[PDB]
Amino acid sequence: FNVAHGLAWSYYIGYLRLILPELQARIRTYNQHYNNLLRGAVSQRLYILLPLDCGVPDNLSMADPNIRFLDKLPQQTGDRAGIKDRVYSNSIYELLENGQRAGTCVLEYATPLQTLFAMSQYSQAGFSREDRLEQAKLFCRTLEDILADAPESQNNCRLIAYQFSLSQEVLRHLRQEEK
Numbered sequence: 001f002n003v004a005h006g007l008a009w010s011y012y013i014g015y016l017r018l019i020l021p022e023l024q025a026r027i028r029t030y031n032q033h034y035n036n037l038l039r040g041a042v043s044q045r046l047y048i049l050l051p052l053d054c055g056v057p058d059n060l061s062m063a064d065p066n067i068r069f070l071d072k073l074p075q076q077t078g079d080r081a082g083i084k085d086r087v088y089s090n091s092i093y094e095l096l097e098n099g100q101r102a103g104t105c106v107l108e109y110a111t112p113l114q115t116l117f118a119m120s121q122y123s124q125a126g127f128s129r130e131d132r133l134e135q136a137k138l139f140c141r142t143l144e145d146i147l148a149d150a151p152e153s154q155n156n157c158r159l160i161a162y163q164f165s166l167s168q169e170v171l172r173h174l175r176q177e178e179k
């Protein structure tokens, strides 16, 4: 529990709190040159995939061929713990449905889940494969409780937890926001 609790707090403090206040302007800036009457604009929140039991690939097209990379948002830099101009980059994806674009959003996995699942290769990391499955659930619940007590971050991101069409799962959450 304390392994998942710590990773959720680390992710909020060292990542979501730094990028979510600036996310809206970065998206709005991308939508300036990009948005027109012939296409859907990039949606306004960070969609964070929280798979409960997945290998967590680096390429979202590997998870679902209906999720394709479109472009990067303009970068966000800042000095952090001795590192000058540490870079925070986010990617824009199209969500296809029946061969046509149905959604456009900034999407990514919660990186601590990928790292958690990779701890299995190391004997000294401890915890069996069944322990890692409960730590993913505990990471998600903790993060959800954090965002519930942080109204600013709450409206700038959407958690997509799940256990298959990943495109349809993201599209479902994306469609709840508009209508």
Ligand SMILES: Nc1ncnc2c1ncn2[C@@H]1O[C@@H]2CO[P@@](=O)(S)O[C@@H]3[C@H](O)[C@@H](CO[P@@](=O)(S)O[C@H]2[C@H]1O)O[C@H]3n1cnc2c(N)ncnc21
Residues within 6 Å of the ligand: 010, 011, 014, 015, 016, 083, 086, 087, 088, 089, 110, 111, 112, 115
């Ligand atoms: N630029 C970014 N893009 C995307 N997601 C990011 C991110 N910077 C943060 N995060 C997220 O916040 C978490 C906490 O971050 P911290 O920054 S408090 O610390 C991490 C963590 O402790 C460990 C593994 O990190 P990991 O990615 S699995 O976990 C991160 C990650 O999920 O190594 C550190 N770390 C990672 N990348 C860097 C880096 N470029 N320079 C210096 N230290 C780094």
Ligand SMILES: [Ca+2]
Residues within 6 Å of the ligand: 035, 036, 037, 038, 039, 040, 041
């Ligand atoms: Ca439009």
Ligand code: NA
Residues within 6 Å of the ligand: 018, 019, 020, 021, 022, 023, 024, 026, 076
């Ligand atoms: Na940002």
Ligand code: NA
Residues within 6 Å of the ligand: 080, 081, 082, 083, 086
């Ligand atoms: Na740093």
Ligand code: NA
Residues within 6 Å of the ligand: 072, 073, 089, 090, 091
């Ligand atoms: Na990117």
Ligand code: NA
Residues within 6 Å of the ligand: 042, 043, 044, 045, 046, 047, 104, 105, 106, 107
């Ligand atoms: Na978005």
